[PDB]
Design a protein around this ligand. Structure first.
Ligand SMILES: Nc1ncnc2c1ncn2[C@@H]1O[C@H](COP(=O)(O)OP(=O)(O)O)[C@@H](O)[C@H]1O
Ligand SMILES: Nc1ncnc2c1ncn2[C@@H]1O[C@H](COP(=O)(O)OP(=O)(O)O)[C@@H](O)[C@H]1O
Ligand SMILES: [Mg+2]
Ligand SMILES: [Mg+2]
Lengths: 331, 355
């Protein structure tokens, strides 16, 4: 019995130890693997930005939101992702899939419904920073109501969002003298509201802005209005670099008041009709003019719903998103 | 005590079991992380190649060298750098001379400046692309100092290698193992010469083994670099060995055991012979043949006569397709080199002339 037991003890001891060093071996590799994956991710993004710049074409991002717990029984259409920038959608009924069929679109980046509010911002960040270095950055969220425009731009108190993570980046990148001119307005019928037509107030502290913004979001079928938000920056250091971080939140061009229809006519003009562009044919287009044409980095979000009942609309959205990413921004 | 050993056996089993599961869980993590790293690297390579395409798959640069300390008063012609792409020159003792490049390096541009144009292509070579770094110009323009450089200021090749080993080291953290095939040769009068041997012989350019498109130089010395010391040794052995072309080829062969993937690319650092006009008591063919192959590639042609010159045949698998080429046109900042400097630069005109 002694011998036998002895044999076990020895065996298990070697196994325990040989198995222990193996655990360390992996941990070392796991640790290293993360670092490398992290370095790889960082590279792709730097390169993804270099690429989008040299291209010139206004950046277009697709964001596909996940279904809310409420609509737990709401049918979804088939979604295929060919890679980081190409997304396809197919209807539940095959009688439409054969007749024209091939609903595949390719943008600068497609966000899966699992994407977080950070995975989004991390792609917008570069623009926000370039604002300080003297650049006019614009960014809106086209899409049908219920798609995610407001959730992307503003977001929810629980999580966050573009606009407000933007401030945490607008000040952090300052830590040279920087003066900021916050601005809020809205367009229901075709008139401007809030503190404007007239002006704004200056930013003082991150809290003051994080508040000034919350102040505006108050006083808000229901949302067929564009939510713009200007943010002029001032570079002194002591000739004065100036850049604005425009933030627009479109209404929704879903199957129907119709200002968005004039925005598309702009996009089309950004290619053909090089002669007179319908910039001055919409109160929205006018404020977004220094973005669609003039030297300015424009980033648009294309919010879409994964629901079948939204198919026709998703396609209209995706389809319009394609032409926009075709405009070669002068810059 | 049997009981004592008996109790240790149970606890050792509990420990082993609890250990087995910990390791198993780490395996699942590791595999996933490895799977994501490879894909992530695959997209990074794609993104990198896009940037190179955008900057141009065939770029031409100008590099004017500073006046030599061996002549304070030998004349310089009237230079005038219009932008960082255009440059002009003018004679003093006998239209307009204005040429555009992807970038113009003046006499103050350092070797690092030059390498900043190449550095990105080393990554391209490790990602399976074939690069061609060319140094065109008349004797004295600065071709050698550019490509090889000097010990006080190493040139393209030495920097390329240094970057190469560092990047190769890093890649091991992704599961990649890299090997470098080095070959050094000289082309004088359409005749190749091995710079790694003393034995006079014959080396013909035959088709590769795994591809009727790749090249193969029979009787060539193909060293498999063991480490930077080995390579260092070779490069020195080779320099020790005018009117010919010098070609230092680095073949980057990466292997990924786990994914069973390979990545084969190559850097072709060429030191073209002088482009001047000969006298009495030719190479200017393998040279014109080279510029034409680059011009032919630009105009996107079909029937390219690579096999025309010994050089264009050798670099054939690196002059077309995904391949990237940098043409550093060296120039002498002197009046007596006006005609030639204009000739050298004039090539840039033909390059961008391709609408
Ligand atoms: N990406 C997302 N992840 C989680 N929830 C989202 C996401 N996008 C939108 N939502 C939620 O979906 C609903 C519609 O979003 P919302 O921004 O109001 O659509 P829109 O503003 O385009 O009409 C809201 O209930 C919102 O809080
Ligand atoms: N950028 C430079 N800086 C300092 N010296 C240079 C530079 N370019 C060329 N030279 C020098 O000019 C001379 C010309 O030789 P080289 O560069 O090999 O010319 P080539 O290859 O065109 O025949 C060499 O002595 C070299 O060291
Ligand atoms: Mg809304
Ligand atoms: Mg030389």
């Amino acid at each position: 019995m002694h011998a036998a037991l002895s044999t076990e003890v020895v065996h298990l001891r070697q196994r325990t130890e040989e198995l222990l060093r193996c655990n360390e071996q992996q941990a070392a590799e796991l640790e290293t693997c993360k670092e490398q994956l992290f370095q790889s991710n960082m590279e792709r993004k730097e390169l993804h930005n270099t690429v989008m710049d040299l291209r010139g074409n206004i950046r277009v991002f697709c964001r596909i939101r996940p279904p809310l717990e409420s609509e737990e029984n709401r049918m979804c259409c088939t979604w295929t992702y060919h890679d980081e920038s190409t997304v396809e959608l197919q209807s539940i009924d095959a009688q439409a899939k054969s007749k024209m069929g091939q609903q595949i679109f390719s943008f600068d980046q497609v966000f899966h419904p699992l994407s977080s509010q950070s995975d989004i911002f991390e792609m917008v960040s570069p623009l926000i920073q370039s604002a300080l270095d003297g650049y006019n950055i614009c960014i809106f969220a086209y899409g049908q109501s219920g798609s995610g425009k407001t959730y992307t731009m503003d977001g929810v108190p629980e999580s966050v969002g573009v606009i407000p993570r933007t401030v945490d980046l607008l000040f952090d990148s300052i830590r040279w003298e920087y003066e900021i001119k916050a601005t809020f307005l809205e367009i229901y019928n075709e008139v401007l509201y809030d503190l404007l037509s007239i002006t704004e107030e200056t930013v003082l502290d991150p809290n003051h802005l994080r508040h000034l913004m919350h102040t505006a979001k108050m006083n808000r079928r229901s949302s067929r209005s564009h939510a713009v938000t200007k943010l002029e920056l001032i570079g002194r250091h002591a000739e004065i670099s100036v850049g604005s971080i425009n933030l627009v939140d479109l209404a929704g061009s879903e199957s129907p008041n119709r200002s968005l229809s004039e925005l598309t006519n702009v996009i089309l003009a950004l290619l053909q009709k090089q002669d007179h562009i319908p910039y001055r044919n919409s109160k929205l287009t006018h404020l977004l003019m220094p973005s669609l044409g003039g030297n300015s980095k424009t980033l648009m979000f294309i919010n879409v719903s994964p629901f079948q009942d939204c198919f026709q609309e998703s396609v209209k959205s995706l389809r319009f998103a394609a032409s926009v990413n075709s405009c070669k921004m002068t810059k």
